[PDB]
Amino acid sequence: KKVKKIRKIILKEDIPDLGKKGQLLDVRAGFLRNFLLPLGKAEVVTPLLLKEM
């Protein structure tokens, strides 16, 4: 019935799957929370950091 968020991110260290610290692949919500944010292996796309870095 329903799909869940597919949330943009930006990286902090190379991904063995999608990109080497540059790409913006909208990973998944069930993925940013554990591997990406626990392991500090990603940063969420804040509109604040974008236009200042």
């Binding site: 919500a29 929370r33 944010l37 626990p38």
Partner: protein
């Protein structure tokens, strides 16, 4: 209690209407749930008990805001 630390989401008092319109009582309660969110400010996990709505909310709004709006940590 079955009360979300981060929102007063209680169970719901709701009668389950049947097809003959026979109303039982059927207390109806939130899917607050055992997880362990990674509190960045300590680089470390904390084990919480979270109404999923509140889980979505921390993510949208960050964690520490939710924290002070309920005053929970440590």
């Amino acid at each position: 209690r079955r009360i979300c630390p981060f929102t007063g989401k209680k169970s719901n008092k709701a009668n389950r209407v049947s097809h003959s319109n026979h109303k039982t009582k059927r207390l109806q309660f939130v899917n607050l749930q055992y997880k362990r969110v990674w509190w960045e400010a300590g680089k470390r996990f904390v084990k919480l008990r979270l109404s999923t709505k509140a889980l979505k909310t921390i993510e949208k709004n960050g964690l520490d805001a939710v924290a002070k709006k309920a005053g929970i940590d440590l």
